[PDB]
Amino acid sequence: AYWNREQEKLNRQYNPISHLNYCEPDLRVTSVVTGFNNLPDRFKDFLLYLRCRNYSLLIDQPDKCAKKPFLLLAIKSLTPHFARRQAIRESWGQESNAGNQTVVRVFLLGQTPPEDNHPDLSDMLKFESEKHQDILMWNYRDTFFNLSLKEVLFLRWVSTSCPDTEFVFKGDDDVFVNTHHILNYLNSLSKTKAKDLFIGDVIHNAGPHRDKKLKYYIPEVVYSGLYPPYAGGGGFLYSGHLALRLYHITDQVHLYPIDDVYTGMCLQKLGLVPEKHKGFRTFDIEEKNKNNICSYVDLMLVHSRKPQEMIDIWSQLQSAH
Amino acid sequence: STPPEAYWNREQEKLNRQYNSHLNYCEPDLRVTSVVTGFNNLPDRFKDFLLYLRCRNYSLLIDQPDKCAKKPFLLLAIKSLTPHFARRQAIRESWGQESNAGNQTVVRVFLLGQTPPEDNHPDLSDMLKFESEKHQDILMWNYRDTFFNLSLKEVLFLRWVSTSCPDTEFVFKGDDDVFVNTHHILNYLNSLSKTKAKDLFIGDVIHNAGPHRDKKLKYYIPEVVYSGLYPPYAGGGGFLYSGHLALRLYHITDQVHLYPIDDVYTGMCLQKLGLVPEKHKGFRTFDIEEKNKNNICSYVDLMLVHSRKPQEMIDIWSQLQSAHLKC
Ligand SMILES: *[C@@H]1O[C@H](CO)[C@@H](O[C@@H]2O[C@H](CO)[C@@H](O[C@@H]3O[C@H](CO)[C@@H](O)[C@H](O)[C@@H]3O)[C@H](O)[C@H]2NC(C)=O)[C@H](O)[C@H]1NC(C)=O
Ligand SMILES: *[C@@H]1O[C@H](CO)[C@@H](O[C@@H]2O[C@H](CO)[C@@H](O[C@@H]3O[C@H](CO)[C@@H](O)[C@H](O)[C@@H]3O)[C@H](O)[C@H]2NC(C)=O)[C@H](O)[C@H]1NC(C)=O
Ligand SMILES: O=c1ccn([C@@H]2O[C@H](COP(=O)(O)OP(=O)(O)O)[C@@H](O)[C@H]2O)c(=O)[nH]1
Ligand SMILES: O=c1ccn([C@@H]2O[C@H](COP(=O)(O)OP(=O)(O)O)[C@@H](O)[C@H]2O)c(=O)[nH]1
Ligand SMILES: *[C@@H]1O[C@H](CO)[C@@H](O)[C@H](O)[C@H]1NC(C)=O
Ligand SMILES: *[C@@H]1O[C@H](CO)[C@@H](O)[C@H](O)[C@H]1NC(C)=O
Ligand SMILES: [Mg+2]
Ligand SMILES: [Mg+2]
């Protein structure tokens, strides 16, 4: 498989044409990937531009972490998702300073360019960024298969602009997160379990989906074998110290079309295994418990909820029993 | 003794006898708790619909008073909710663009109410005000924007046509999740006789419909609320009518009680005018066949298709501009 063979080459370089800033189309893939011409467009773009990751930040918040945070909330989003971001601001993503444990929030965006037929929402996004001061936007095409790029550029921003946050929560903009429970959990940790914390909805021994109709389909010609253990499904929680170690190792791992698999590949290279926490309810909760606020007291996150549902749950949680 | 009709029917019978306050009484009408059988067991949307039925004098908070300074040929009026920024912007850029080919002016408004914090809506109100200042195409009224208040959205829009755009030749009223082939609409309007034009009303018209009685369905209506059948009505995403008829509809709205389903209410008003809306097969409110969805020639001969995402509307519109070369 192509990714496996290219990654083996990387392994030989680090453990005896750039893979990091070559940003012309890599036309060699049209010769060496069998059946390249019949691959879906997302795979063609992924393969042609694999070796380019030096994209610039167009909208930054460089002093976001001027007061060293206890918890950084970093939420993946797309330009048009205004209601999702605003509901997060008002509910579980509120910034705070309780107990002098500061919580800060950023949203992680790429471009939604006109060539992909996106409406031009640059005026609204600028208004939102000036009002709320929490948008980070980079100059790459925001797509599902560039989410591992979103991951690497975010880790690069943690390294440059938020290196001292004690913990990081990285998650999606359609999950409900019980941030109080997350904070209670983090404050229970020993110094030892904290320095390399990485928890979430972790699966072992998964492999690529081979059914061409599935969202996470990966052809055999792109990747072979099984996936490393990885946390997926909507969000995960880890230490800022480990964030720096993860950023440093990203140069040694080729980007991958599925972001959460990529993060698992970086952890494996560090010799770490992410740990499952049952409070990450990435397949929702039982239908019978969905209208009982007590079901939300004992979890970390649940996928998926609409903007109004996030605000409704958060408001009810504040008076739970 | 013949069985009593449902609550809506009995109030409409009263209205009919008065014409042959129900308009600005805005306290809760507590009489409904006594006369609507099983009121206490109704879903909340019905309780609110019934308690505030007699109130329709809500203020315009964001207006575009000069929208029709030049008498339009076609007014595009698109129902939307505050958070739908991407839908509105895709419509502006594609099929809802304002234009003036052949001096037949096309102008656009989006029709909004409030999305208040009490309904757990995120606060996007400052953004909306900025959007209105940038694009000058938002009409916003001070009422709670909900599915069961869409007939209120209809009446307040028709009131605005009467006060602020009474001379538009035609009106298209539609949803913000449809693709509209506005070029085909303009050619259709330019094909009409003077007489067919004065009372044009076309869309995806259903005859012989009645209220859905299954409590799990979106358009469920209890038997204690409405009894009997629906008049013919155009539904499904948009419909097209003359500005002259728009004024006749506005006048008759005082004579028809509001109704939880906006397109049925419009059908009720047309019936009271003695008109029957006409089906046009180009209103593809259940979409087109899967095998045709990626052939731009399928969009050339339709009026509208439900439903399309913002990126899909822009893609279709872009390809449509050169479809004459392939179709
Ligand atoms: C991930 O994001 C990157 C950066 O935005 C995307 O790279 C860009 O991809 C487009 C093609 O989709 C490239 O445009 C094409 O360039 C060729 C060669 O000059 C030109 O002939 C085509 O007409 C078209 O303009 C663009 O150069 C490239 N930009 C870079 C590398 O900076 C990439 O597509 C995204 N990947 C995925 C999986 O979405
Ligand atoms: C359609 O829009 C109207 C106008 O916004 C909505 O009327 C408003 O409905 C709410 C209840 O949902 C009323 O608030 C309630 O008032 C009572 C006392 O008056 C109070 O005890 C409740 O706690 C709550 O505050 C509000 O007064 C009423 N406003 C007006 C101007 O009539 C109506 O609910 C919407 N209808 C539907 C079907 O959504
Ligand atoms: O091009 C993209 C597609 C998705 N997302 C974000 O990625 C997350 C997961 O998207 P989705 O819910 O569609 O994935 P799923 O839960 O189906 O795996 C959400 O925060 C989306 O806003 C993104 O940032 N860029
Ligand atoms: O409270 C509401 C709910 C919906 N809509 C608009 O009503 C139209 C139809 O909504 P929907 O697509 O959900 O209805 P359906 O196609 O299922 O009948 C769309 O323009 C929505 O933006 C609205 O203006 N206010
Ligand atoms: C990355 O670096 C290369 C070489 O310095 C440069 O040519 C390219 O433009 C950069 N890519 C981007 C997207 O900035
Ligand atoms: C409608 O008019 C009545 C009486 O003039 C007034 O009491 C009421 O507040 C008005 N309704 C609204 C929503 O402004
Ligand atoms: Mg999701
Ligand atoms: Mg619809």
Numbering used by the authors:
A (entry chain A): 57 to 72, 90 to 394
B (entry chain B): 52 to 71, 91 to 397
Quote the paper.
The majority of mammalian poly-LacNAc is synthesized by the alternating iterative action of β1,3-N-acetylglucosaminyltransferase 2 (B3GNT2) and β1,4-galactosyltransferases. B3GNT2 is in the largest mammalian glycosyltransferase family, GT31, but little is known about the structure, substrate recognition, or catalysis by family members. Here we report the structures of human B3GNT2 in complex with UDP:Mg2+ and in complex with both UDP:Mg2+ and a glycan acceptor, lacto-N-neotetraose. The B3GNT2 structure conserves the GT-A fold and the DxD motif that coordinates a Mg2+ ion for binding the UDP-GlcNAc sugar donor.
The crystal structure of SeMet-B3GNT2 in complex with the donor analog UDP and Mg2+ (SeMet-B3GNT2:UDP:Mg2+) was solved at 1.55 Å resolution using single-wavelength anomalous diffraction. Two molecules were found in the asymmetric unit of the SeMet-B3GNT2:UDP:Mg2+ structure that were arranged as a dimer with a ∼924 Å2 interface formed between helices α4, α5 and α12 from each chain. The SeMet-B3GNT2:UDP:Mg2+ structure reveals a GT-A Rossmann-like fold comprised of eight twisted β-strands and 12 α-helical segments. The donor nucleotide sugar binds in a pocket located at the carboxy end of the GT-A fold β1 and β4 strands (secondary structure elements refer to the core GT-A fold nomenclature in Fig. S1 and Fig. 3B). There is unambiguous electron density for the Mg2+ and UDP bound in the pocket. Asp215 and Lys223 form hydrogen bonds with the uracil N3 and O2 atoms, respectively. The other side of the nucleotide sugar binding pocket is formed by Loopβ5-β6, which contains the DxD motif (Asp245-Asp246-Asp247). The last residue in the DxD motif, Asp247, acts as a ligand for coordinating the Mg2+ cation. His356 and two water molecules also interact with the metal. In the acceptor-free B3GNT2:UDP:Mg2+ and SeMet-B3GNT2:UDP:Mg2+ complexes, the Asp333 and Gly-Loop305:307 are only observed in the inactive conformation despite the fact that the latter structure was solved in a crystal form that is isomorphous to the B3GNT2:UDP:Mg2+:LNnT complex.
